[PDB]
Symmetry: C4
Subunit: 368 residues, 4 copies
């Protein structure tokens, strides 16, 4: 029955906040609120957003800066801007073109696609959208070790150059919108189907997580690293000691995230946790940051705070809903141009310059 939008078009993006209410008009109610909502009464989602006001950028002048360069490299991938696509389940909730739509946007823009293990599209379908573009695969682990070896082998054969272990979802967050909507997936999840008691199609996220592994330990990081022979990111980190644990267990990257506030409730805004994590990582491996990035100023602040790249999520999926691959592309294009302005005004010629920026501490918070 599920009526996702199908129109493909470029969209004007004045800011990404506006994209939420615009997408609400064309995405089915249940799937829309699955995308936009968060745990509890969403205080931690708001904290993700308001955390950006805690550290403020300085305009800098006579900086000898012209035509700032947004390109950077991560684990040997040359990318057009210091952002990648976050792994997000079930893109068919936003658009009929689903993950193949997002992939085409990401590949044509020139950055990395993260593929969710809970994708509604097959590796084949996503691949067609990517048309050779770089991809990282995000695993939600099976309890069965051989099923993990199989999923990993499949992802690597498909072209994955890194594995993302998402470990902050051993059980579902208390997502009140989905409870109240009795939200259930309107389609299957071909990559993890093998460990579900049928198809994801009738099921709640609660029961899908939880078919997944609960008893994740540092051993799983060493094992995934060992088996795949690929660099492994550990995703969902908010406490510095977990970054140290992950690196000691063989991780090649740290991915700071609170899952866009969809997991543990009454936790800090993700940005506030980043400096402590970056201090503990001590440059040993690259850091991806996510959860609340909406503006070029947010990309800059994350890099100035110890991140190497950020990952984008909800705004790209809202762009997807509004215009397919072209809509998603408009959002990526927006972020690149937004960051370019910020770079010029802050005195940053290149991405490495962003990493060195002074930030103004704002002890007053949001209301100032």
């Amino acid at each position: 029955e599920y009526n996702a939008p199908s129109e493909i078009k470029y969209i004007d993006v004045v800011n990404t906040y506006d994209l939420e209410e615009e997408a609400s008009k064309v995405v089915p109610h249940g799937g829309f609120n699955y995308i936009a909502g968060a745990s509890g009464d969403e205080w931690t989602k708001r904290a993700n957003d308001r955390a950006w006001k805690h550290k403020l950028l300085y305009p800098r002048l006579a900086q000898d800066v012209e035509a700032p360069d947004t390109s950077t490299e991560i684990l040997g991938h040359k990318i057009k801007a210091p952002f990648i696509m976050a792994p997000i389940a079930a893109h068919g909730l936003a658009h009929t073109t689903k993950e193949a739509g997002t992939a085409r946007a990401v590949s044509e823009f020139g950055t990395i696609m993260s593929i969710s293990a809970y994708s509604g599209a097959t590796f084949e379908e996503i691949s067609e959208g990517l048309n050779g573009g770089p991809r990282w695969f995000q695993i939600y682990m099976a309890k069965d070790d051989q099923q993990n070896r199989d999923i990993l082998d499949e992802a690597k054969s498909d072209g994955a150059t890194a594995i993302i272990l998402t470990a902050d979802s051993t059980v579902s967050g208390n997502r009140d919108r989905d409870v109240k909507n009795k939200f259930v997936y309107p389609f299957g999840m071909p990559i993890v189907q093998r460990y579900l008691r049928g198809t994801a199609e009738g099921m709640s996220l609660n029961n899908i997580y939880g078919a997944s592994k609960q008893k994740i330990s540092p051993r799983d990081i060493e094992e995934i690293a060992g088996h795949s022979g690929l660099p492994v990111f550990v995703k969902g980190i908010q406490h510095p000691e977990d970054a140290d644990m992950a690196i000691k267990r063989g991780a090649s990257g740290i991915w700071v995230s609170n899952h866009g506030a969809r997991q543990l409730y009454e936790a800090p805004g993700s940005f506030d946790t980043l400096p402590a994590i970056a201090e503990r990582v001590n440059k040993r491996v690259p850091i991806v940051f996510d959860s609340g990035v909406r503006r070029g100023e947010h990309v800059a602040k994350a890099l100035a705070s110890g991140a190497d790249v950020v990952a984008l999520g909800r705004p790209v999926l809202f762009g997807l809903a509004l215009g397919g691959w072209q809509g998603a592309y408009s959002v990526l294009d927006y972020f690149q141009k937004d960051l370019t302005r910020v770079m010029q005004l802050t005195g940053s010629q290149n991405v490495e310059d962003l990493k060195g920026l002074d930030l103004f501490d704002n002890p007053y918070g949001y209301e100032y």
Copy 2:
């Protein structure tokens, strides 16, 4: 004619906050507002709730955690979760099965019932509900010493294995709702009738507190302990010197509480007072915490901050209003499952692990 709800059934519970509005639909106006309301313009009731955003939980990963155990023990009672029922007067305002209904819920769930001296039900009617389950008796002291000895004897005979002295209500708080509604009890209080010079039934709360003891001193604690031979909690503690006072006077537990913000106004949120009290207590006796617990995240935060258990109040009474014993049971069950999720996500295998959690300090407020 007090028309209290009488239907008995389990209820859903997405969050406890929503229970308040739902119960307002079925509880008479005067009694509902007596349960819901607090002192002054209720700024301190809001402070109780907002204090939970001062200390934030970290999600933790690769912890090596599966199927967390919420069971614990207090003063020798094995309980199924680290929460007990708070002593609350006049449960007949919420539901026709009154205190016997709450007792049945509490006993079936498998935790401790606290019986209010201002119960609308007799020890006998409660005992029927408890069916042998553990109970603690909360006294509001008579001015007459013999009457106290008799109340305590009756409590101990009925099966009480601890006594709670509530000492923060020697006069009533400024409860604006009840003044504006001219609230008065619609039924009697059997346990304390002996000192009311009549029945609680015509009476304002102002005047029932007024009949109880005002000149409580540390000797009262010693005398209750000496007479009953039961461990004594002192309830209402917000200042660390009161913890020292109480222990020196023979108390076997400290119960940190601001009476659900129903007493002194323009005081701190209760959770903000707990660390100073726990430091002062220095593990000499158990600590019970209450005043604003609404979520599994709050149980975890209270324990991480030096409580051994928490006491639940308003949400259980709204639950009783909505479905009698089964509705109250649904609330207890919600808290146990809510805590179980929180334990999985924070890395806590058992209740003692919650007590050692790191908390992120949030110096910004509620508005972040």
Copy 3:
């Protein structure tokens, strides 16, 4: 033309904040807003109110306290509770009985009436209400020395036991309500007619001429407390004029500790600007004040019920403070002065 309320009745006071809205319905718009309004967009008036949430009271248990005594003494006067009436001219906006109505409430209650030298009522009307009760007189400095000597003499002659010199009003505050309402005070007995160039000698000279103890009123900076005492002020009145004067200044309560620290108990401290609750009286005492002064809530009581309505507000404050003493473990007023307070760095939204 001015049609103040004239009805005389006791009123139920659940809290004093509700009294403003209630009063607005029986007092002419212009006059009502002259009473209620403050400078600029009234951010400092809100600061006076929200400052109370910066220091929070503890409940205290097993304190051996039974029937707290609210009574106290200030420069010789035995009063039933540690609050007095603040000097306000224009009670006539609130009620036909003007300053005489408030004087009667204050006298029957058993505390001190501060009488402005600007009052719309004649002293003889006022003296009827006072019925022997104590009174202090508030003045502004005139530009003309003989006017001052004359007004001072008149105050002494009228039974005054202290002089309150208000010096925070050398020019008016920027009161937007009064400007937008084109409000014109209708009664006889301004900032500009009075003395602008007030110096410490003015206090010395008022101290010399009057036999009486002099309060300096409007203090918010501790250096002015030093200055005043050195000049023969027998008391410090901490006030920001109900936020009707300097805009974008601190809430009055936030200034109290630093001033009390400097005064070092040399002279009594009266605190005002924002008192609405018994909790507020407790908090001001715990922070260094000896008594507080009441303003707006009494005037709203006067609008609603004349002397009886005003008495209902004073009675409210006494019973409110009495609850706060019982629960904080204070047997008496000296106990309030020694209370621990909880620091709330989160402020109003917590």
Copy 4:
């Protein structure tokens, strides 16, 4: 483009009200060009709320009467410690344009800052000024010789200082203008929507050396928020520091301008004068800026709203409002003169705007 043309004195109870009043007489695009700021305007609101961070003390028995607002800056005697900020395109607000503003300013008795993006010629503004003092604000061209030309034509007009605005190498993200598709409805004679783009991006400390080297005049570097930039600009030959965030129209999610001022003033250490702008709306704000290290403030938006409502007379009503508003504040804070204001204690308010 239907700019208002009515000339009259106006009532000013406060400058905040002027924004809604002007909205009713200025065309939608132009008005929102003037009123608007970057992003969701959080930093514009920060500019305003920053004033609640440091609070004035009233003071008693201070021996004060008839406060003197007059001061002096770079050899100019002005009647109050404020000047007119350089604002583009005054014809958006009123048909009399920069000449209307220039008249109010000159008649009130302070300094006119002329924007490189003015829609009036030097000669039209000169007529409004009638010999009054003027400073000129340059948006640098990419060609060195054309800057030399502009600076010559400015100097020859009578500019006694040069203001280099260096915080606009590209435009801020002004959502109102994007949504309205704002385009200028008239020319800019001094430099003749993609302007900024044509102007110089790669500004360096060399440029400020070269502007001072070439022109006669003391150079202000405008748009400073970071104390390292004030040091840089002094090292480079600037004779003045102009602390500004361009009224929040440039970098978004940056501090309110007033919160940056003490750190800049400390680093300047009285080496050169400091002009402060971005959010000044009350006499209390002029006071607080001077108490925090500024020598004068620059006024922007309220003056333009005044111009929209009453041409030169409206603009004058605003300048007069600020002068009287400051006078009251001076009386109540115990300040006899401008130097007094610069020594005032401020109460620190760690609580927000919400207190």
